[PDB]
């Protein structure tokens, strides 16, 4: 309608065009990134454009020789994008350790995408709850910095790292400000619009993306809302990047007012702490971030984070979107469901392949909406 979020929608639809033109404009390298734990500040400080690999949500038959079909649709969809040449402009590829299934995407990509010139695996600690994890991750981040300085031949100074962290933290703060509008009774930002913003943050130059977020927030105070809010939903899952599916959800008489997913809140939630040692500031920002299920032990801190978000954004119903075969989220799901339901939030469970016909999902969401309207 008013088209306020059209720049984010263009960036998402035309992400590869954007990357190629960025290389023309800057002379810089592009790095395909995997998992939201990638320490992007280092890549930015090294003069590089980080672009998060995402799937295309279309039929594909190139990954069967590389990844066995017992593994999730996302790790296979992502790998196909590399094999099909759609990230051929990316010189680098990098993964920061998390879910073990995702590590296959990285391993097959670096071995079989012939445009890869360098790769790096960051073994970020999984046990962020350990008193030793932040020292261990400090040294991983410093070692990646040394790798990147050696690779480019250019010293990556503390000043360059601080300026990059400042851009990333500004992006995180602006995304949090954008999210704040979703708490209102009639949100000036829909779930789809929020997702266009939060997803493109992961493959657009953060300086350019911040400028667009600032323009967007400058408009929001005076933005007219025409649509009815309907039921207040939360979406929960691992990546959850099928924006078309989210648009179906919001067309049934609902608004997604908050999420727990790596296309959204779990990517950006916290900015780093003020801190004079920039490597510590960066490494700890990631250790302190709301945890992937894989990194959430011995305590399930995720359960309090998800319920807290649900309460803070006045959620009426929570929708679990699950990738087939997704072990980390499958391991949390039964008790996280219970935690929400015991605290007054009914839930719906939906399970996804690489592609699925949307009609059966719409019928289920419409039925869920009915449950909300009773009691």
């Amino acid at each position: 309608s008013d088209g306020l979020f059209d720049q984010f929608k263009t960036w998402y639809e035309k992400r590869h065009d954007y990357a190629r033109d960025w290389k023309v404009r800057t002379g810089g390298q592009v790095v395909a990134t995997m998992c939201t734990y990638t320490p992007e500040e280092l890549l930015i400080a090294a003069g590089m454009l980080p672009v998060r690999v995402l799937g295309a949500h279309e039929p594909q038959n190139v990954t069967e020789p590389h990844i066995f079909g017992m593994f999730c649709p996302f790790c296979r969809d992502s790998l196909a994008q590399g094999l099909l040449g759609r990230f051929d402009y990316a010189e680098g590829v990098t993964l920061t350790q998390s879910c073990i299934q995702y590590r296959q995407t990285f391993g097959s990509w670096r071995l079989h995408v012939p445009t890869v010139k360098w790769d790096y695996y960051v073994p970020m600690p999984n046990e962020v709850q350990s008193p030793h994890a932040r020292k261990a991750h400090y040294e991983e981040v410093q070692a990646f910095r040394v790798f990147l300085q050696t690779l480019t031949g250019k010293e990556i100074t503390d000043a360059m790292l601080s300026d990059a962290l400042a851009v990333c933290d500004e992006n995180r703060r602006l995304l949090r400000e954008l999210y704040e509008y979703r708490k209102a009774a009639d949100p000036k930002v829909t779930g789809v619009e929020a997702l266009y913003a939060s997803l493109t943050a992961q493959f657009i130059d953060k300086r350019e993306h911040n400028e667009m977020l600032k323009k967007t927030l400058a408009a929001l105070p005076n933005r007219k809302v025409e649509r009815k809010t309907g039921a207040r939903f939360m979406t929960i899952g691992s990546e959850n990047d099928d924006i078309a599916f989210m648009g179906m959800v919001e067309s049934v008489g609902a608004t997604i007012v908050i999420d727990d997913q790596c296309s959204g809140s779990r990517y950006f939630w916290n900015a780093s702490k003020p801190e004079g040692d920039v490597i510590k500031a960066i490494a700890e920002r990631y250790c302190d971030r709301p945890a992937c299920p894989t990194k959430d032990y011995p305590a399930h801190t995720r359960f309090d984070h998800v319920l807290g978000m649900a309460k803070e954004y006045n959620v009426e119903g929570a929708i679990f979107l699950q990738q087939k075969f997704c072990d980390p989220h499958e391991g949390d799901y039964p008790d996280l469901k219970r935690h929400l339901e015991e605290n007054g939030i009914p839930t719906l469970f939906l399970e996804f392949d690489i592609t699925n016909p949307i009609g059966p999902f719409r019928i289920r969401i419409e039925a869920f909406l009915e449950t909300l309207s009773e009691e």
Partner: protein, 438 residues
């Protein structure tokens, strides 16, 4: 069929009895005020051993495999876990273990015994989730060692620091949870015994390189399992030495596990129980499985020997390295475990591919049968890149799908037909090669 002498393993009965005693000791732990704990076969079990000689583990994956042998009980356990609400495509050992806990039934009789604490290693994602649910249902303390520091070959001081410092937290944890004072002498003894048993298991496996193979992998499943029960115990280390003497005597005497041996096979991950009968059928072709990276290195610890071959890792006291104090023992113990071959593919599948190609060479393997194991994400990640690397090398290789713990996902009929087709393929290849070289 008359090519080689054969003989049944004489220590068979003792291997069986040691395993039975392990499970019975866990169930009877409290009769004399012992300690019980649970965790993976990959848990660093010398740390709980510092709390006394009456500290009994139940390792989760071998226990679940023992339930899986009882198809009916395993189905009941998985049905209970599904009723709770867990997805059926989660790790089949984890689902079996959960269901047996909810049913409150031990596979060896009696209630499911309550552990005093969880002590776990985390490298597979399901390693945390498995015992998070257990510790919550049992209301017990829980500790997790994060060993995700990347390939052993890339190890740094800081990476080893992270694991060693966590182990010191683990010592404090087990003291708190048990109420006992940790004893450096018992701990160091347990570290040394774990180094002995895991290196000696590797030495035993390395005897299988000769023709005829003295062991078959079906027989080895009753032998490699001891280190998955309590690799840090004296009984396990002493049995591995005894076992090595017997296998050395088999090699000296030209004893074959399979008397008509003509074809040597290598497998990969843990198979379903129903496959064992296929090994027996394979023997009518003269095919013997000599092993797998799984049997050799789920617990076996290896090094490069002076001739470039793969053998048991040298014990530090045979290298002039003393172990006389807790801090030295902790760091050496972390380093020993980080070298485990079966942890490397969690980071880089090509490390496992190279390991499989080296086993094919050194154990003189004619053909490879890969289990695409839908029941275990942790040991299946990278499996198709491993198949590709073996395919390129020119060694015959086939796959079959299964699930080690849930036979709903294993097709006995189709798998046996695929394995028979493979035997035909190996024959055809032999005829062609002979025709080319006359």
């Amino acid at each position: 069929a008359n090519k080689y002498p054969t003989e049944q393993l004489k220590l068979w009965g003792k291997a069986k009895e040691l395993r039975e005693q392990y499970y019975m000791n866990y169930a009877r732990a409290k009769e004399k005020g012992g300690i019980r704990w649970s965790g993976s076969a990959w848990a660093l079990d010398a740390i709980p051993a510092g709390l006394g000689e009456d500290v009994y583990s139940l390792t989760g994956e071998p226990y679940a495999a023992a339930v899986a042998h009882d198809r009916k009980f395993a189905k009941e356990c998985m049905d209970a876990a599904e009723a709770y609400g867990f997805a059926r495509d989660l790790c089949s050992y984890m689902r079996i273990y959960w269901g047996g806990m909810h049913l409150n039934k031990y596979a060896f009789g009696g209630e499911f015994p309550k552990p005093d604490f969880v002590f776990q290693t985390q490298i597979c994602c399901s390693h945390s989730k498995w015992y998070q649910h257990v510790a919550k249902e049992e209301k017990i303390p829980e500790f997790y060692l994060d060993v995700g520091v990347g390939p052993y070959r890339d190890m740094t001081d800081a990476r080893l620091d992270y694991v060693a410092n966590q182990l010191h937290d683990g010592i404090a944890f087990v003291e708190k949870a048990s109420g006992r004072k940790f004893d450096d002498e018992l701990f160091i003894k347990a570290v040394k015994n774990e180094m002995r048993s895991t290196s000696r298991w590797a030495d035993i496996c390395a005897l299988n390189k000769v023709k005829p193979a003295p062991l078959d992998e079906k027989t080895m499943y009753s032998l490699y399992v001891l280190c998955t029960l309590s690799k840090s115990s004296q009984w396990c280390a002493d049995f591995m030495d005894e076992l090595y003497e017997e296998v050395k005597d088999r090699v000296a005497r030209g004893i074959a596990a399979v008397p008509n041996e003509a074809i040597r096979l290598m497998t990969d991950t843990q198979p379903p129980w129903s496959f064992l009968k296929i090994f027996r059928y394979l023997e009518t072709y003269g095919a013997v499985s000599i092993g797998s990276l799984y049997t050799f290195a789920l617990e076996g610890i290896w090094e490069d020997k002076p001739d470039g071959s793969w053998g048991g890792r040298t014990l530090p006291w045979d290298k002039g390295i003393e172990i006389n104090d807790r801090d030295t023992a902790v760091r050496l113990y972390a380093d020993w475990n980080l070298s485990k071959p079966q942890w490397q593919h969690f980071y880089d599948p090509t490390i496992k591919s190279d390991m499989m190609l080296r086993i094919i060479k050194e154990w003189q393997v004619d053909g490879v049968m890969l289990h695409l194991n839908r029941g275990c994400e942790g040991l299946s990640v990278g499996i198709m890149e491993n198949r590709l690397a073996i395919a390129k090398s020119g060694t015959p290789v086939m796959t079959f799908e299964g699930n080690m713990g849930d036979e709903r996902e294993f097709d006995e009929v189709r798998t046996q037909a695929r394995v028979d087709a493979f035997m035909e393929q190996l024959g055809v290849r032999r005829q062609a090669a002979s025709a080319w070289s006359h």
